[PDB]
Design a protein around this ligand. Structure first.
Ligand code: NA
Length: 319
DNA sequence: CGGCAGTACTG
DNA sequence: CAGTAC
DNA sequence: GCCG
C-alpha cells in the first residue's frame, strides 16, 4: 500500500505538471497514468523491461524512469520554460485555465497582484482570485463534516426525507479535503425536484454561501464559509439527482477523477458507457443517433458487477 | 493513426 | 462557438 | 504521454 518509487514519481510529477499548465492536456494525462501505475507497483522498478511490462508505461516513459533510477535526475526537467511557474500560478485561479494563464503571461503579467489590478477577469475568475489562498489549502476532514451537515440540515428542513452525502475525497476517507461535494436525492419517486432553488437561497441568506460560481439546473458550484472567527472560504458543490441515478452519481462524484476515467474506459471495452447518470448499453450510430438502454443500478456494487469487476470501496478508489 | 467522456454553464 | 470544470 |  506504499509507493516504492517515490524519488521517481516526484520527478515525473514535475514534468507532468509542466505539460499540464502549458495546455498539453493529453501528454499530461499519459504522464498521470504512468505515475499512478508507479505508485501502486509492488516494488521499486529495477529495469527498463520491468517498466515496459507495466500498463500505462511505454518505451518513452520507461526511458525516463530508468534515467531517474540510475541518475537520480531527469535531464528534461532542466529544460522547462521559465514560464511554467507563472502559468501554474495563474491557472490555480478557479475559472482560469491554460488559455487564460497563457494570455495573461503574453500580456506581461507575472503575479497575482498584477492580475488583481491590471488584468481582465470573468466574474468566476474574480471570485477565484480573491479566495486564491483559501482554495489552495486542503481543509480538515472535520470541517468537511460541518459543511456537509450545514447543507443537510438546511435541506431536510424542506423535506426531511432528503438524503445528503458528502462525496469526493471525503467519502474516500481522506484526512483532508480540497473541496466538498454534497450529493442530494430522495428515496421516494422524486421529491428532489423543486427544492434546489429554495435550499440555495436559504443557505445564502443564512450567511453560509458567500459567492456563486455556477448555477445549474441540478448542479451548483459555489463558495461557502462556516460561521465564526478565522474561518476560511471553502469550495462547495451541491448536486441534486433523481433516486434512479443515485448509484452512478455517488460513484462519479466520489471519484477520484482518475478512477472515473479508468471506469469509463473499462465500460467501453464491454460495449458500455458510464456517466454520472447511468451505466448504459452502447449508443445508436451511423455518427450518433440515439441513447443506449439504461441498466438499472440501485447501488455502486451493481455498477461494478455489470462491468464484471469486484467491488472497490471508496477508500480504494484513488485511481 | 485516433481516442483518451459527455456534458453544462458562462460569455 | 471557446474555455473551463465537473 | 499510452494503447489498440
Ligand atoms: Na484553475
Amino acid at each position: 500500500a506504499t509507493n516504492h518509487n517515490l524519488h521517481i514519481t516526484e520527478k515525473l510529477e514535475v514534468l507532468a505538471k509542466a505539460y499540464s499548465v502549458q495546455g498539453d492536456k493529453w501528454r499530461a494525462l499519459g504522464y498521470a497514468k504512468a505515475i499512478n501505475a508507479l505508485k501502486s507497483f509492488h516494488k521499486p522498478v529495477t529495469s527498463y523491461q520491468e517498466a515496459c511490462s507495466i500498463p500505462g508505461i511505454g518505451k518513452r516513459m520507461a526511458e525516463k524512469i530508468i534515467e531517474i533510477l540510475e541518475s537520480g535526475h531527469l535531464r528534461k526537467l532542466d529544460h522547462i520554460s521559465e514560464s511554467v511557474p507563472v502559468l501554474e500560478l495563474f491557472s490555480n485561479i478557479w475559472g482560469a485555465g491554460t488559455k487564460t494563464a497563457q494570455m495573461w503571461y503574453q500580456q506581461g503579467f507575472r503575479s497575482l497582484e498584477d492580475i488583481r489590478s491590471q488584468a481582465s477577469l470573468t466574474t468566476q475568475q474574480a471570485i477565484g482570485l480573491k479566495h486564491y489562498s483559501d482554495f489552495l489549502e486542503r481543509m480538515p476532514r472535520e470541517e468537511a463534516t460541518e459543511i456537509e451537515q450545514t447543507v443537510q440540515k438546511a435541506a431536510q428542513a424542506f423535506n426531511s426525507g432528503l438524503l445528503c452525502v458528502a462525496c469526493g475525497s471525503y467519502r474516500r476517507g481522506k484526512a483532508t479535503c480540497g473541496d466538498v461535494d454534497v450529493l442530494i436525492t430522495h428515496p421516494d419517486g422524486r421529491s428532489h425536484r423543486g427544492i434546489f432553488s429554495r435550499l440555495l437561497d436559504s443557505l445564502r441568506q443564512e450567511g453560509f454561501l458567500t459567492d456563486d460560481l455556477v448555477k445549474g439546473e441540478t448542479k451548483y458550484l459555489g463558495v461557502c464559509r462556516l460561521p465564526g472567527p478565522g474561518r476560511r472560504h471553502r469550495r462547495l458543490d451541491i448536486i441534486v439527482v433523481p433516486y434512479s441515478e443515485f448509484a452512478c452519481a455517488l460513484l462519479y462524484f466520489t471519484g477520484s477523477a482518475h478512477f472515473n476515467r479508468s471506469m469509463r474506459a473499462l465500460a467501453k471495452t464491454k460495449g458500455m458507457s458510464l456517466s454520472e447518470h447511468a451505466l448504459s448499453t452502447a449508443v445508436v450510430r451511423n455518427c450518433k443517433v440515439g441513447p443506449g438502454r439504461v441498466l438499472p443500478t440501485p447501488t455502486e456494487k451493481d455498477v461494478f458487477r455489470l462491468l464484471g469487476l469486484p467491488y472497490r470501496e471508496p477508500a480504494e478508489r484513488d485511481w
